[PDB]
Every structure is written in structure tokens, then in C-alpha cells.
Design a binder for these strands. Structure first.
Ligand SMILES: Nc1ncnc2c1ncn2[C@H]1C[C@H](O)[C@@H](COP(=O)(O)OP(=O)(O)OP(=O)(O)O)O1
Ligand SMILES: [Ca+2]
Ligand SMILES: [Ca+2]
Length: 341
DNA sequence: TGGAATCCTTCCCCC
DNA sequence: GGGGGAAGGATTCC
């Protein structure tokens, strides 16, 4: 068992660089304009030029202009990055058949049937970093170990433009040494529960009675951290498929009025239906982001697939259900479509 | 901001 | 008691 994990660096920004090389050397910030005010929006990502000054994914765009008033700010062109990504995936598909496409910018490859050890793996690493640098002009970080979680961690250490092997002895210290907050799947809310439980490192997971751990963070998560800690996590590489498709959009004002919201909602369905493209959903959800950034959703499953005129009419009922059941104003509104035939 | 997975808890119908 | 749903929310990650 030997897993290789690949992670395209500062991806959306690097793609705008590849597309206009003049941009190299300059701090680049790829933004998502919400279009309420001027520069209402958030940061989708920035190159390391910008990132070293605090500008990063999820700070408002106004906050990023106060730090770097002369950086280059580009609106997000997703469809573009979506295609460049595909082309690269295809490249890796020739390095192995066992390949999990994790996100727009990550993939793990099972390379047992291709390689004999951590030296031969390394070489395959550089063989690939190179081939992507060559064909597509994009730098990636490569992390390597016995499973996916440690391949990913390896990569976090080695970024950007890095390559790294975490071998079976280094995994051993890391269970003791690694801060559990730095484990994939443990976000701020689990990190805090785990601290008040006495777990700051991966290895303190064993010192607790399981059923207390289950009681704090869930079973699924508890079994995960446990197996990880017993050098015993070993989930395989899967070809995961889209389970849902949707679209959420921001209104120029916060509103409670049904006629004010509807056309935002209809545009969301429209784009959603395009994105489906010969896919037929059985489930529609209406998601609202209320004025204080809380998220409330109402939905419905059908026995048949959903056509557009049915998605139109049913979506308005579920939005009604939200206004009725929740007293707050509405900042964002959209749809998600799941349960494909 | 915008997208999408997965888990958990609760409710329900019913052997 | 338990299987099998669905629905709504919570959490994470990119
Ligand atoms: N919070 C976000 N909001 C919008 N888009 C995001 C967000 N996070 C990530 N993305 C998008 C843009 C990123 O380029 C892409 C990949 O994310 P990610 O791999 O974590 O970091 P990154 O590619 O920007 O740089 P890095 O090399 O540091 O990981 O997904
Ligand atoms: Ca990356
Ligand atoms: Ca974290």
C-alpha cells in the first residue's frame, strides 16, 4: 500500500497567470463579486505573492484591498479552471487507473501496481510534477504515504511546489507529534471539542473510553481518528460521482418579499438545469442564507425525475415554507438538485 | 462567495 | 427493537 496525492498550487490564481504570464511576480487575488456594493464579495484564492501578507480565501474583498491596494483583482472564471483541471486529470489517468478525483484540484493515485518503494515513488512524483509543468505550465505539490490521509498531510507540509514522502516510521512519530487540528476532517468545531476532552495529539485518542468520544464528536468521526491512530486507516481510492448540483446567488438587498426573491430563485434554477445536462434529479432543495448568515433549507423528494416547469413551481412552495417558518430576512437564495436517475 | 460531500439527529411508518 | 426512509441541520473542505 502506497498512495500518491497531487495538489495544484494556488490553483485559480495560477491558472489566471498561465493565461496571462505578465501576472507572474505580482500579487494576484481571484475574487467572487457579490455585486451588492462596490467590491462586495469574498476572496476565492490568491497566489503566494498575495498570500504572504494575509490575503487568503474567505476574507472579504474590501479587507484584501486595505492590505494590498495595488494587487491584481480578477473575477472568478470557473468554467475555465474547470477545463484546465480536466486536462490535467487526464494526464494522471495514464499514470494509474486507480484514481480518485477529490476536488477541482486534488487527486490521489494508487500506485502499488506501478512502483516498488518510496524511492521509485518519489521518482514517479517528479516524473509527474514535470509532465504537468511541461504540458500545462502549472506547478503542483505531491505528497506520498501508505494511505490517503497521510499523503494529503505530506502535501500540506511540502507546499508550494513541493514533493514529500512520509514513510512508515515518520507516520509513527506524527501520530504522537501532529496537532490533531491538522488532521483532514477536523475543523474548528471538532478541534475545540477535542481540546476540552484532553486530546491535542492524534495519540490521545486511545486514552479515552470510546463511548465518551462517540458522545462528543460522533461515531463515524471517532472510528476515523481511532483507526488513524492505530496505524490502521486504509480506505481505498474510489471513483466518486456527483451526488448533487446547485446554485446559490446573492440578492442586491435582504428581503422577505416573495416577488422580490423569485427571480433570483429562477435564475438559480436555470443555471442549475443547464449544469445538469442530461441528468435527471428526483430531489429539489431550496437553500436560504438568512440575514445573520444562518442557513435554513427546505426540500422534497419525488417518485419521478423533475422537469423544469415542475422545478419552477415546487421551488416557490418550499421558499414559502421558509418565509412562513423563519422570521428573518434573506441574503442569499438558491437550489440544489440531488438523487439522479 | 459559492459549491458539494457526509455525517447526525429526529421523525415517521411498520413488521 | 429494529430496518428503511426522508428531512433538516451541522461540519468540513476546496
Ligand atoms: N473558501 C473558498 N471560497 C471559494 N473558492 C475556494 C475556497 N477555497 C478553495 N477554493 C477554490 C479555489 C482554490 O484555488 C481551489 C483549491 O483550493 P486549495 O487546494 O485548498 O488551495 P489553493 O489551490 O488556492 O492553494 P494552495 O496551494 O495553498 O492549496 O478551490
Ligand atoms: Ca492546492
Ligand atoms: Ca483544521
Amino acid at each position: 500500500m502506497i498512495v500518491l496525492f497531487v495538489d495544484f498550487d494556488y490553483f485559480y490564481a495560477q491558472v489566471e497567470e498561465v493565461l496571462n504570464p505578465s501576472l507572474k511576480g505580482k500579487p494576484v487575488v481571484v475574487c467572487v463579486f457579490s455585486g451588492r456594493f462596490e467590491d462586495s464579495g469574498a476572496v476565492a484564492t490568491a497566489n503566494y505573492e498575495a498570500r504572504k501578507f494575509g490575503v487568503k480565501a474567505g476574507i472579504p474583498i474590501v479587507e484584501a484591498k486595505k492590505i494590498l491596494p495595488n494587487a491584481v483583482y480578477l473575477p472568478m472564471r470557473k468554467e475555465v479552471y474547470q477545463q484546465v483541471s480536466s486536462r490535467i486529470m487526464n494526464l494522471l489517468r495514464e499514470y494509474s487507473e486507480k484514481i480518485e478525483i477529490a476536488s477541482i484540484d486534488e487527486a490521489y493515485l494508487d500506485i502499488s501496481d506501478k512502483v516498488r518503494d518510496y524511492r521509485e515513488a518519489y521518482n514517479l512524483g517528479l516524473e509527474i510534477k514535470n509532465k504537468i509543468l511541461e504540458k500545462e505550465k502549472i506547478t503542483v505539490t505531491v505528497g506520498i504515504s501508505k494511505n490517503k490521509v497521510f499523503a494529503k498531510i505530506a502535501a500540506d507540509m511540502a507546499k508550494p511546489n513541493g514533493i514529500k514522502v512520509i514513510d512508515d516510521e515518520e507516520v509513527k512519530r506524527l501520530i504522537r507529534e501532529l496537532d490533531i487540528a491538522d488532521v483532514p476532517g477536523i475543523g474548528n468545531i471538532t478541534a475545540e471539542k477535542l481540546k476540552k476532552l484532553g486530546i491535542n495529539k492524534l495519540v490521545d485518542t486511545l486514552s479515552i473510553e470510546f463511548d465518551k468520544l462517540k458522545g462528543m464528536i460522533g461515531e463515524a468521526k471517532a472510528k476515523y481518528l481511532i483507526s488513524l491512530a492505530r496505524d490502521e486507516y486504509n480506505e481505498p481510492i474510489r471513483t466518486r460521482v456527483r451526488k448533487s448540483i446547485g446554485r446559490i446567488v446573492t440578492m442586491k438587498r435582504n428581503s422577505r418579499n416573495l416577488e422580490e426573491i423569485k427571480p433570483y430563485l429562477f435564475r438559480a434554477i436555470e443555471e442549475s438545469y443547464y449544469k445538469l445536462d442530461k441528468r435527471i434529479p428526483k430531489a429539489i432543495h431550496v437553500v436560504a442564507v438568512t440575514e445573520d448568515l444562518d442557513i435554513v433549507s427546505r426540500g422534497r423528494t419525488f417518485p419521478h425525475g423533475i422537469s423544469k416547469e415542475t422545478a419552477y413551481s415546487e421551488s416557490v412552495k418550499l421558499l414559502q415554507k421558509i418565509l412562513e417558518e423563519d422570521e428573518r430576512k434573506i441574503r442569499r437564495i438558491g437550489v440544489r438538485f440531488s438523487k439522479f436517475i
